[PDB]
Write an enzyme that holds these catalytic residues in place. Sequence first.
Site, short mmCIF file in Angstrom:
data_model
loop_
_atom_site.label_atom_id
_atom_site.label_comp_id
_atom_site.label_asym_id
_atom_site.label_seq_id
_atom_site.Cartn_x
_atom_site.Cartn_y
_atom_site.Cartn_z
N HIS B 364 0.77 -1.24 0.00
CA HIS B 364 0.00 0.00 0.00
C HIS B 364 0.82 1.32 0.00
CE1 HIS B 364 -4.08 -1.93 0.70
NE2 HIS B 364 -3.27 -2.85 1.14
N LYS B 555 -9.42 13.97 3.33
CA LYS B 555 -8.52 12.82 3.47
C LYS B 555 -7.72 13.06 4.75
CE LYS B 555 -6.77 14.10 -0.39
NZ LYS B 555 -6.71 12.95 -1.21
N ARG B 556 -7.03 12.07 5.36
CA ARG B 556 -6.07 12.29 6.47
C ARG B 556 -5.00 13.38 6.26
NH1 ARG B 556 -4.49 9.91 10.63
NH2 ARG B 556 -5.57 8.05 11.43
N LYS B 561 0.30 14.74 1.41
CA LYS B 561 -1.00 14.98 0.79
C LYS B 561 -1.19 16.47 0.38
CE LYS B 561 -3.92 11.19 2.62
NZ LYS B 561 -3.48 10.14 1.73
N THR B 663 -8.23 6.66 -3.37
CA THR B 663 -9.54 6.09 -3.68
C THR B 663 -10.58 7.18 -3.51
OG1 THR B 663 -9.45 5.27 -1.48
CG2 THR B 663 -9.42 3.57 -3.36
N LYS B 667 -14.06 8.32 -5.78
CA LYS B 667 -15.41 8.58 -5.29
C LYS B 667 -16.05 9.86 -5.80
CE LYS B 667 -13.63 6.54 -1.16
NZ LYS B 667 -13.26 7.13 0.10
C1 PLP Z 1 -12.18 6.74 0.82
C2 PLP Z 1 -11.75 7.46 2.14
C3 PLP Z 1 -10.42 7.63 2.37
C4 PLP Z 1 -9.38 7.39 1.25
O1 PLP Z 1 -9.08 8.74 0.84
P1 PLP Z 1 -7.96 9.30 -0.01
O2 PLP Z 1 -8.30 10.67 -0.28
O3 PLP Z 1 -7.80 8.36 -1.12
O4 PLP Z 1 -6.72 9.28 0.97
C5 PLP Z 1 -10.00 8.07 3.61
N1 PLP Z 1 -10.91 8.31 4.59
C6 PLP Z 1 -12.24 8.14 4.36
C7 PLP Z 1 -13.23 8.23 5.52
C8 PLP Z 1 -12.67 7.73 3.14
O5 PLP Z 1 -13.98 7.40 2.99
#
Ligand code: PLP
EC number: 2.4.1.1
Lengths: 828, 828
Positions: B364, B555-556, B561, B663, B667
């Site tokens: 990952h 995102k985190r 990032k 991911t 979305k």
């Molecule tokens: C899908 C999702 C992620 C993955 O996010 P990225 O922007 O790809 O890092 C992280 N946290 C939540 C709650 C998500 O639903």
Amino acid sequence: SVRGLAGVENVTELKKNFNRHLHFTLVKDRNVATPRDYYFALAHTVRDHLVGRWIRTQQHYYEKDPKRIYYLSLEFYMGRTLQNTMVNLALENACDEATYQLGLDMEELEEIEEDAGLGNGGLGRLAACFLDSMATLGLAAYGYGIRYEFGIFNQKICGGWQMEEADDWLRYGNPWEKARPEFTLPVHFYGRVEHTSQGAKWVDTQVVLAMPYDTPVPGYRNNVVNTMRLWSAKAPNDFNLKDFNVGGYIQAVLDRNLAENISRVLYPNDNFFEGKELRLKQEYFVVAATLQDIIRRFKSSKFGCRDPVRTNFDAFPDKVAIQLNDTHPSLAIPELMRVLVDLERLDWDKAWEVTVKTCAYTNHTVLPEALERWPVHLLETLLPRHLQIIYEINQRFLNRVAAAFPGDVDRLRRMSLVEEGAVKRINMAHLCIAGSHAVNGVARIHSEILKKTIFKDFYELEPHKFQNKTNGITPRRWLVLCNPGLAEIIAERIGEEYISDLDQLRKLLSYVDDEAFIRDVAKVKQENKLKFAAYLEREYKVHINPNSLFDVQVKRIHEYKRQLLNCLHVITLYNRIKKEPNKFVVPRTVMIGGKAAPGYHMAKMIIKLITAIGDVVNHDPVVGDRLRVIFLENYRVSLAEKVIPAADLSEQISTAGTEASGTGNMKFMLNGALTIGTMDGANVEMAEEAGEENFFIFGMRVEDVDRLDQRGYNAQEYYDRIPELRQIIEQLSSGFFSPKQPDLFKDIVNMLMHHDRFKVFADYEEYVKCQERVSALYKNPREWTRMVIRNIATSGKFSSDRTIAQYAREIWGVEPSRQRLPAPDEKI
Amino acid sequence: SVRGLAGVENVTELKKNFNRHLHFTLVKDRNVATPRDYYFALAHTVRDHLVGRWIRTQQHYYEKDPKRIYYLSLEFYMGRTLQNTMVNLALENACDEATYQLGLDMEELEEIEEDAGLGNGGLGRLAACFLDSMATLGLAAYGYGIRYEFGIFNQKICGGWQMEEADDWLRYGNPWEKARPEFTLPVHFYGRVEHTSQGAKWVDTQVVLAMPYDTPVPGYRNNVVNTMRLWSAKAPNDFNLKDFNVGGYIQAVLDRNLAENISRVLYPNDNFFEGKELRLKQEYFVVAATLQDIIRRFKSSKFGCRDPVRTNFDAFPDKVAIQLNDTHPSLAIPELMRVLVDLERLDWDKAWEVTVKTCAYTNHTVLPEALERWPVHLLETLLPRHLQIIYEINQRFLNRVAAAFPGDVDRLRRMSLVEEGAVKRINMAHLCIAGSHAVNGVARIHSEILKKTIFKDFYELEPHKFQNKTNGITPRRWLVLCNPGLAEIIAERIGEEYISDLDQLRKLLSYVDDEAFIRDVAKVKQENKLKFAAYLEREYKVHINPNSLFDVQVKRIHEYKRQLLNCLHVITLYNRIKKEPNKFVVPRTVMIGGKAAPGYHMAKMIIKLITAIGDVVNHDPVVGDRLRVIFLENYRVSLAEKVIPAADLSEQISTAGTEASGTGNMKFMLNGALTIGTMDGANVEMAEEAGEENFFIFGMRVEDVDRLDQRGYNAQEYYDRIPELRQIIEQLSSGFFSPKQPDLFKDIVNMLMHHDRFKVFADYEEYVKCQERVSALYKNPREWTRMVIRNIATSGKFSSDRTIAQYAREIWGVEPSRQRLPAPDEKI
Ligand SMILES: *Cc1c(COP(=O)(O)O)cnc(C)c1O
Ligand SMILES: O=P(O)(O)OC[C@H]1O[C@H](O)[C@H](O)[C@@H](O)[C@@H]1O
Ligand SMILES: O=P(O)(O)OC[C@H]1O[C@H](O)[C@H](O)[C@@H](O)[C@@H]1O
Ligand SMILES: *Cc1c(COP(=O)(O)O)cnc(C)c1O
């Protein structure tokens, strides 16, 4: 049997829900369903039948607004809940045909249920029996406690010694409880008091949340289901993490276990006091949450609809009554004082009126080491406010004393709720007599002992407060549920009205001489003895002989209960057989069982003696099947339900004046055992009820114990006076019974010869002669059974329905109702 | 909507069970039932509908005996379970008419459900999306993890700073799980190894018990319900108390919390490694229990019936396949070696054959500080046996290397599973490539990066092992469940076959110019924007303007990032408005949300910057409604489900080569947002699929990052090259945004100017120009929506149904099945 209609429609009805629950709640198929899966489907099919009655009973107290009774105990020794619920709803015959058809055997599924061992012994069980009788007698009563994760330990004997193991009882779920998170309340600990103007304030406190879980309490066949509400400890989400709290994230999340440890383990000390801070935490937490929910039900109930004055606590002793089961919730008294004065802004003297008319205390023992005396330092720290309120209460109380007893300085210091010298302590029983309107003792002799000896000062200031309410047992669990044979042959002659009207049992006096009745009463006992002898070898091993007299002592291991005297009798009887081994002896299986507390060394040493005598006795080829000595492992409510129906002889041998009541004694008289005992606790009322001749009382009266203490108890005198006794003390000192380890019992010997507070030797001659008389009766089966019939026909007074009916009427001010409410539910 | 038949019989059916459950499971009346009581009745009425399918699916894999797939993750970021279950069973319309009739509103009851936040972010969610697609594609798959009591914390912002609070998620019950105590297994920790003859023995170990709890995993509308099995830690009853263990009774009962702390809290570290012993305990406990239950299902299943040879593990890689979700269950590899060699008595080389053909690993990330390298000392202590097996595996592996690469000493030390110098450590990714037959990366660029850079040695020994399986998202939760508007206007034109066949979405290319379709696609977005702007003021407050461009990065919070680059853009845009405040600017609501780990200081300092810019920007009367900067509190699965449907612009800005896949990006492309981003992770495949022109890629390619690192990244150059950038760094250093506290951000400044590993300044010019291009398109609503239509019609490849279909076929060796099993249950 008097186990209900076993109809066609209702077996179909139960067969069908046992099946939905297997599919929907257990989510299993028949092909892969586990025994525990099975018991869980039937436990859910049975509880669907009382759900309409609980909703209907609790809405109806809300319509009617009765004076509610709250019984507060840190102990509820409930035992298992499934059979008891089918008994009370008259469902046992149909759950047994319906499971039969499904191919199961309901008695193997019953045995899969774990015990609610949220009690220690005696006072634990009494709260459980009261709850049953309050629901039966249609009282709007609520039982309140702690939901422990770990009840009383499970006792293993290993090498002859006790082994305690975590009673992990909620391990697999509990189908009987219902959590109620909307009623979660906060309990404050520690902090400090600031005096701000229109109040003393209790400030910067640690909060621990209390989560309730309701269990149903069905009355006997009357459509009343009351609640037992048990509180769980829960850490607040935020504060364990949050303030500017660096320590680490994962550790602040893991340290939440510290706050949830309040409801984790029952203290396993039966009649003993350990001043542990965590015990005072359990006592304040059950009380603080419970007083909050009492006031939520009062302020709402038909006081939030019409509401005026400024909502008033004057009505409060007429809508609420709380009962203190020993000193363990005494904190209720300064906690109701805190809330009314500090939070409701009441006047001191108005709030002291309301507290005393609301509270009543039940004293359970007279043994000093059991009495709770908490250090002022603990109170200091943990409960800053409550220690101020206790000093103000003390203060005014000992000013009522001075006033009534002028110049009697000694008295004042004898009545003080605070005891001086070296580690200042608060006497919690003096607090309870002071803030309470009724103090009662649990057997008429224990209640004389109180007003004569321990609380004579208190009785002289306020005689009007001192009551007696003799204890009782519940005919439902202790006869109908554990001994359905006996209940059927009784109802066949005299009807079934007696399970809710036990003095009816007196009608068995016309059949004392009835030849078929004498034969039914003895068969039932042979069958009950024959079942337990089997279970004994299926569940453990020794092999007993069902044609012996089953001599049983089952209760907690204590010095005052004199398990050592029954041991001295058994070595006497073995030594007699070894001297004249070819003479006839009425054969007997002596069973002794009970748990010792962790680190009550003498008690744990007495379990080692019992199993050391049994290793010796049980393999003497000369003794053969004449004497078998058995220690009964992990004695609990569900085990008392198997051995009390099979007992012939009941040992009830406390040194006079130590056993406050006993209840073990009453269970055995209901079930057809004869009693041997001293004139102590409720054994005095039992013999008076059965007639002295139909009983085996022996030994010292409380009178003689005293006369001996004034002269000075000297064991040496008994030792060189009785040769049978002197032989047994050198068999113990010479290592006869620990024959690799001779010093093993030199501990038991020495306290016997030099430090016995309970006078084992002084009642030995008399007990061995009285026991000889027991056996002479056993030799003639017709006269044993007609004595048995005069004890069973006379146990109506030892029902908890009379105990509770007397409590309701002369302490709580409410009337019993025998009649049916018309629940269940609705096909709406 | 494409939310199922809303029939007459089925509303009656659901209205009726919601009512039984209120009475029987909740034991409440309508008059006193709580909102949570309500949600619990409906959650039980919905789960009664999948109970026949789960029993039927699990018996059927037992009939059929398919090769089963086990996905092992310490993370399953499931989110809430109720709506998702009604979607998949086609019940959402009828639960909504039936609750409507009962007078309730199903969307308020949905919101009462607590999230299963048993994941951190990215890999957490991917395990949850895979599980959905394995059930849909009819695979006999099982998801395995840890049942944590505490999932990822809940984030509170207080004074602009993050506050973490215990995610107490099972606080009120979980209706979706099913405990299975018959499957409880022991996990051994510590001990020692004795070499006894016909075996190395692992001896005198501490045992901790693992209790499973099954959750249903329904496939989309096909009658398949697979299981997620989560293990709980449970102390053994006896040993915590027992050995000759004096310490105290109450403390040995309370110290059981130490052993149960294994399943207590998820580690909240997203892409970071903390060598905590308790983390290695969670990794060994999920693995040890899971391998035990794999082998229970193999040895039984149609191997305990016909059984011969000596029962053989040769069939094992053909009946079992396990997937390692990152290095976190790498222990599976020496644990399957331990069981087969030490317990099954297999030969080393037979068992190494079986392990590699059974195991496959998914890498990952490429970020070094995230890589797990455990100290040999931890392994020593905790897992004596596994450290020997790792040294033997190492041993033989680096002998295959020497043999293929003669004399290439450096390589050997580069391939070593054990890293030298100062605190010897084991590289867990080298272990996983070695004991595994397939290593894959999660986006075609990340998988080139692997075989070119980090695992080039490994790839040169075994190229045959290296795969790519690009990630995906699930059309069910991420479109049908969170954005039913958009799914209805799509199925109206092109049918509903697409929710289980997403490349069908390509048919929306014929409507790119369709005037009613262009208007439906934009309305739906205005409605979704209008709903979230409301929720924003009902649940929190600021007041946003739904006519702005909704610019969101969720995102985190991490440095790679580049949340700081989006912050530099927002101070640039504010400064532009303040200089020429009377020129038109396309208005925008910038939303940034995400959680920082406990003690990732830079990350926690970046949340403070975002809310410090928002305090300033949001009250400039000159800025008015043109720029609003919002930080989105406590971003989780259920919140991603509200803001991703309302987003217009998706920030996807990692420095190239750090984001392995993303991911979050997929979305947003499903839901109608345009993407701004760098050519990184799965953003490269997305742009290739949508066409480059329908996308906003800007900045450095992984090529340029490198060319810059070889010359040496110098921020000073950018600072004195761009005046817009130089102005922003002195506003931060002068205390413009912390105007009482000027040194507050001198921390963020300094790492930017001197220690930036992610080259924020180097991509700033280009990003600000690319963003200008975003706004020029927003200015013309028809062309924004036809670009949006070319991104939505092209996201078929980013379905987890393709990801899983590629995994099944080229790693796991099984075929997908799209078709219906014929469950549910039986009216027997
Ligand atoms: C899908 C999702 C992620 C993955 O996010 P990225 O922007 O790809 O890092 C992280 N946290 C939540 C709650 C998500 O639903
Ligand atoms: O008396 P209360 O505390 O207000 O609770 C009232 C009762 O409501 C329902 O009937 C529940 O079944 C009971 O569990 C609960 O005891
Ligand atoms: O596959 P197993 O582990 O043997 O369990 C098989 C299944 O039995 C029943 O259907 C239960 O509903 C499932 O919860 C369980 O998953
Ligand atoms: C009734 C009972 C008791 C009370 O017994 P006594 O002999 O009166 O001390 C104690 N323990 C159990 C389990 C009982 O059922």
